[PDB]
Amino acid sequence: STGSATTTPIDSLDDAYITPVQIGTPAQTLNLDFDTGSSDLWVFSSETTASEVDGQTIYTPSKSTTAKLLSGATWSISYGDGSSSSGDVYTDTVSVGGLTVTGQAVESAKKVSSSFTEDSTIDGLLGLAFSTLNTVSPTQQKTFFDNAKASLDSPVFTADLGYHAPGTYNFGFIDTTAYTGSITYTAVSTKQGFWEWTSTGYAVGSGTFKSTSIDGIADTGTTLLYLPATVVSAYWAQVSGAKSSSSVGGYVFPCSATLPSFTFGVGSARIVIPGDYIDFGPISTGSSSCFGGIQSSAGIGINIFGDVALKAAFVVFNGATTPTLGFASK
Numbered sequence: 001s002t003g004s005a006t007t008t009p010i011d012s013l014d015d016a017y018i019t020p021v022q023i024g025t026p027a028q029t030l031n032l033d034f035d036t037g038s039s040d041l042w043v044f045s046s047e048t049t050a051s052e053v054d055g056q057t058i059y060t061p062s063k064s065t066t067a068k069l070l071s072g073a074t075w076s077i078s079y080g081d082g083s084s085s086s087g088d089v090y091t092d093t094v095s096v097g098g099l100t101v102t103g104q105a106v107e108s109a110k111k112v113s114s115s116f117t118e119d120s121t122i123d124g125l126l127g128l129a130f131s132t133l134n135t136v137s138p139t140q141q142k143t144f145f146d147n148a149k150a151s152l153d154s155p156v157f158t159a160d161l162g163y164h165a166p167g168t169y170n171f172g173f174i175d176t177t178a179y180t181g182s183i184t185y186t187a188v189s190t191k192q193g194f195w196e197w198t199s200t201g202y203a204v205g206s207g208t209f210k211s212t213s214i215d216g217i218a219d220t221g222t223t224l225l226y227l228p229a230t231v232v233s234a235y236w237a238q239v240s241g242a243k244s245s246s247s248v249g250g251y252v253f254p255c256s257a258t259l260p261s262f263t264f265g266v267g268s269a270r271i272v273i274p275g276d277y278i279d280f281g282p283i284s285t286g287s288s289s290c291f292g293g294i295q296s297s298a299g300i301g302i303n304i305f306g307d308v309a310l311k312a313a314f315v316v317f318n319g320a321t322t323p324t325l326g327f328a329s330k
Helices: 144-151 229-236
Strands: 003-009 017-023 028-035 041-043 068-078 084-096 099-112 124-127 156-160 167-171 184-187 196-204 210-218 225-227 243-245 250-254 262-266 269-273 279-282 289-292 294-296 303-305 314-318 324-328
Touching (some): 184 196, 229 250, 229 294, 250 294
Parallel strands (some): 028 124, 225 294
Antiparallel strands (some): 041 124, 068 084, 156 167, 156 314, 196 262, 225 303, 243 250, 314 324
16 A cells, blocks of 8 residues: 655644644544654644634544543653643544555644644644654553554655645655655664664755764654754854744844855765755844754754655655664755
């Protein structure tokens, strides 16, 4: 089997991407944030505290003939940005782009933090990291990808995120028309439950490439590119007027600037992030100070290849017995 679904930016800055997902019988379609940095499929639901729902589409398990309470199971998750959610668990039929999994754990939110409530466009998350990170207790549950894997033509999914435009998540096949040149594969460590890999270095604009190992995670659920302070300082030093602002919470730059590109290494290959991808616009409405798309990972504890980086590539998440990550230009 295979699946193919279009993923769409939630706003004009590509802050996140939503992908329609069919849950239950008859289908209830919710728009989920596919997150390769976590491993829970959770949804706004009929059980979500009413004051914490503001415009989201909800899953109502009582209206699904295939929903079954997973007795005794609870979940609770906290994300890197300080947001969180928790609730109980149903199993139900879940389909993405024509690919169907029966008995998928659908984690129903009883509580969500303010950032989720305030984002009317995201009806939940679909985790695509390794199932060892799944938060269901007392019986850990498998991700949609893990459940689908055996049925897939090939044990892979691909992320093809757009810049200010729709893109695609595919399951079970590599669309050879979706990228240019060849795909370069690189080793993955699953030790922390993430798609964790080591970039071979970077360049700023037309500058020379610096060979240096940068361990980090491929994370579709994080907006920006978080890298070591040394790397980030070297980037922003090439932008007149750029500075790190503790009050704003990162590097800002004059909105009048033209940003240089940023290149990262994948083995001997190179992925180029155009400068425009690094512009996240005014810090507040009408400001001439703009927020940078490359920020320091110092005190996150991990480097994060978020959407800023991933949307510059066609990315293969290879879930074979020995997992790997592939990157191509597009």
